[PDB]
Design a protein around this nucleic acid. Sequence first.
RNA 1: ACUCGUGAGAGACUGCCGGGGUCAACUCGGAGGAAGGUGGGGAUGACGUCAAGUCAUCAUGCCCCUUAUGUCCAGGGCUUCACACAUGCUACAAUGGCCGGUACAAAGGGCUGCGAUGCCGUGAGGUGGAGCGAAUCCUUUCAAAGCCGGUCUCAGUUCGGAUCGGGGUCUGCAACUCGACCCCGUGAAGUCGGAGUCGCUAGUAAUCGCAGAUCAGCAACGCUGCGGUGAAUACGUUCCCG
Lengths: 207, 126, 126, 82, 153, 100, 98, 116
Amino acid sequence: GQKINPHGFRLGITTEWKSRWYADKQYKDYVKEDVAIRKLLATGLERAGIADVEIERTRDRVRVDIHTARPGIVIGRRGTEADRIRADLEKLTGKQVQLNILEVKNPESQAQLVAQGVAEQLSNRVAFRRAMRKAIQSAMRQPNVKGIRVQCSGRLGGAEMSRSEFYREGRVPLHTLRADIDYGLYEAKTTFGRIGVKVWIYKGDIV
Amino acid sequence: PIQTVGRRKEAVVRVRLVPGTGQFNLDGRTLENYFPNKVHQQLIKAPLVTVDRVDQFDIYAHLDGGGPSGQAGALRLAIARALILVQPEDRPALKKAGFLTRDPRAIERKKYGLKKARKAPQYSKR
Amino acid sequence: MDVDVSTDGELPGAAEYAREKIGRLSRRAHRPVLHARVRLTRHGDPAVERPVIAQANLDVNGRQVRAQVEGVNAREAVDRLEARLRSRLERIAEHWEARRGGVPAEAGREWRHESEPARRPGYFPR
Amino acid sequence: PRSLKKGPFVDDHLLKKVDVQNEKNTKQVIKTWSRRSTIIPDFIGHTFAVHDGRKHVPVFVTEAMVGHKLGEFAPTRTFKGH
Amino acid sequence: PRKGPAPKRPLVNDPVYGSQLVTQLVNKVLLEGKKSLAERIVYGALEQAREKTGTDPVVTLKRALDNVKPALEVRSRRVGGATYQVPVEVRPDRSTTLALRWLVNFSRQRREKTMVERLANEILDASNGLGASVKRREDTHKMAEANRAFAHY
Amino acid sequence: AKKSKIVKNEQRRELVQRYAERRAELKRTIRDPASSPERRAAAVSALQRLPRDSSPVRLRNRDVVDGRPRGHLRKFGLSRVRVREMAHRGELPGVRKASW
Amino acid sequence: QKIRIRLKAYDHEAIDASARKIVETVTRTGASVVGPVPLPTEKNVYCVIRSPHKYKDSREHFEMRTHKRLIDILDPTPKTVDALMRIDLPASVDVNIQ
Amino acid sequence: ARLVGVDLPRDKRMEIALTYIYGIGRTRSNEILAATGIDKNMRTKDLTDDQVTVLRDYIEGNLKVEGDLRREVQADIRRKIEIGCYQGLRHRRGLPVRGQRTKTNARTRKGPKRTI
RNA sequence: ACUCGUGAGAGACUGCCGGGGUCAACUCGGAGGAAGGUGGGGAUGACGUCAAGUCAUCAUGCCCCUUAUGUCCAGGGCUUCACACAUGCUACAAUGGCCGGUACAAAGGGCUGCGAUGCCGUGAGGUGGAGCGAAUCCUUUCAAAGCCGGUCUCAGUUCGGAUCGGGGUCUGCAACUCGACCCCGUGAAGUCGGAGUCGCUAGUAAUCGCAGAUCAGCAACGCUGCGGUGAAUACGUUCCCG
């Protein structure tokens, strides 16, 4: 175990909590319903890139905000997708649950989306070098990106021997607290097993 | 009036100094009912001795936190501070004696994997 | 020499063979052996070409001697372990015969880390 | 031991079994599984086949073994020596 | 001590005797941090000595220290791949430390039913030159002398 | 852990709320005062007739999703393995690494 | 008659913002306030093992910190009270009215 | 002083001397000394004959000590043995009877260590 | 007003002085200062190694079971004991044991939980329920080592408490296997431990108590924290280890 999770390193300094509420007696069941919501949204939607899911609660009403790179896919033009998600979130005993669907401004500057794309390419047929090079170039093309590192490991290329490979470009100062490191991990489903892709993206520092 | 504080490893002492006799009032108890240890008394009175102003200040003190040794150290620091407030021009005498320095020695935090702050578990090679 | 063997799974007769082979190494040790442990393990995966793993640990008067080998069956692993342990014990000897060639010799010929430094006068020879 | 206020503990199964056994004054072998039931003075004659983990071992009650539990007379672990 | 010497702790003078040596003695007899008990033991022993002899206790304590203070000690030295018992001169501080440690220990194995009494008897006999600590100094000097051949290195 | 055992834990909880709420508690109130006539009442025997699963003494705090029976934390209802992973991802409000 | 206002939140900035906003609205309504009296921070510490299996000696510590603020007002005119039920605050901060 | 056939220690305080009776510890001696009235801290050579008599008849009255206690304890152990209870065979084979671990410890019941 | 609690800020930067220095890094000493030279302690663990550990947190390729290797239940087992190894606790006592009086902490926990006053027991405890979602109430007003007084007088003892006999309390459906605690009795080994070996450089080691998580209860002497009292020593890198 080498490196701690970058989000947890800067949780109180740079990054922010993804769940915002206060509970004293009802902390445990709040946590249970939050994880249920998260797993439901993870399983239901896979096509549009789900970069982040926030949950806010206040007594009866529950506010869940999600960021996706393809908002049109997850939303029903007549509300059909909205109807389905609303109903099955009511079924999660959430009382009144309301949704704010959002869109990320720069999908290529978001680590989770980058890892999702790399893993999706890896799954079907693509050689891993191609995927890493393409992701690195696309991210560095963005204005705020100051450094990106992509690393994936496993039975790469269907080999019998597991391997770890990584390429870096620019600056990725993992030990610096003020530097904001966007971290994204997502597992690629291949016929020979499971391939894990980790992405670190560095875009300046916040003081 | 004048009032200072002394702190020594979780012991806090509030002191109120007045120009009366050498009466020591420590939370309503005397220097004998309190601090029944001669070394502690000498540690208390050392700033007075180096300033030679013994038995010319009635002292009222509030004690809370720590044990007798920490309380005595904090009281000595408080007395030195009170003296520096009363007669400023004695500062070299007290400072060169070190009575003006707060002691930054605290209980070291216990560390996981070790029995104590530094003591490590016995390890057997065989 | 008493040896305790902690095998696992299926290795019939490996314990007796290992005990009998290892116990013969006591005479080779130049200091009394305080403890001796042997562990025999087998790899679950049939793809492993040398599944059986044998490890040993001897406490030679406080000096820890250990070795580890792999083999295709219990007997071969035990024999290779005995060979490795014998080599280690040979390299550990540390009695006079084992360190008589490393003790610095001569007076000016040859230099070593622990060689006696030459005595030098205050004034340059000239 | 159990507190005295609660009183002794006997399972209902073998309690009912022994009440119907002693009401006609003959004692057949009673097959039980409740090693936790204590011995009551109502058991003095009855022979119990208390469970052991593998089988049921016959236990013939006397005056002395009153107040103990049936499990005390069905040794579970078997040891013969090394 | 690989990178150089370490600073020494400046322990304070004792209040009721005004000497460095008695504080050193109480710190030597100290066990488990019970400093008050150590001070009681040392003060009681000094008062017993004063009662028995009738004079100041610090002067006789100093006399005992000088009687048991060593000057020559033996340390194992490895020169040119060989070890020998080499007599070595003792610095003043180490001599005081050794003398105090010897006094405290040899008083700990006396038979006077109480540590204060044992300590007082030991210091008195050391003052008069009959203690077991005096003896120990005699054997350490004897051993240093008997190995004088190795003093050249 | 095992799906059957995760389920069986829940079944115990619904059994507990159904029975231990009043049935397995009034009998205890009967047995508490020595003045109360317990011996003829057979409140002990009546409470033996109740299912064992009524008793909360048979319950087990498992991880709310994972099913992990050990290393449980009552504040979160989560295993030590899961708490570490979600706190690191900023999922539990007001939780962070320590220093002092 | 005066009523106590208690604030509890995991974030110091949010609780400070809530405190100053509440003071602003109550002084808008024409009330006397005692000010955001600070209260001791509650610290709950948890220690866990990093690895899923064995490796006990490696542990990780977490805390949960709760900040508490105390608001006390006087002269409870109905306008101030009605304004009090009509304040929007972040979901992080809860308000206790007594 | 011969007390219930027990030779008392030559010079001891009373309650701790009375502890030397097989059926008496420190509590029993204290309470009986308080009850019958003989002083608690007087030495064992200061007893009068009447004091020995009052200790004798009191102890024989409301206590059981010495041989009767030993034989009653032996009878209890033997009766526990012969009913075949768990503690019975535990006593038979000299192993701890109160659930103590026997994998490593329990040398008190096992006696001195033997090598095999 | 003084503490304190929690918000903001100042404050240590070789900043200044003197000397070594290539006038360079850097280094020694001094002043000021609460603190002086990364102040103390944390969090943070590069590329990799050891096919290290974990298919029993989880997920997962392939293989296998599928009237069973799934699944329900009662009882038992994981606690077995001729031994061996490892980590600890309690001791072998007078720097102590016992009794009486008496003084100083920090941190933390508490809702179907903490639970006080009172009353009943000798004691675990029983009855009862004040007040408390708690800087408020309860954990006693919080400690023990400490200090003072009395006793014990060097003994396998007024040391040591194992083991065992009898009697109880509480939790729990239920303490036989297999809980903790309380009372009376019992009173083992043990006289400071061979070869060898471990930790620790200062608020440290040693020693004293307190709290928490898990938890109906507990095998907790374990683990994670908190404070009380508080040492000795470092000449120096030849040797041992990395």
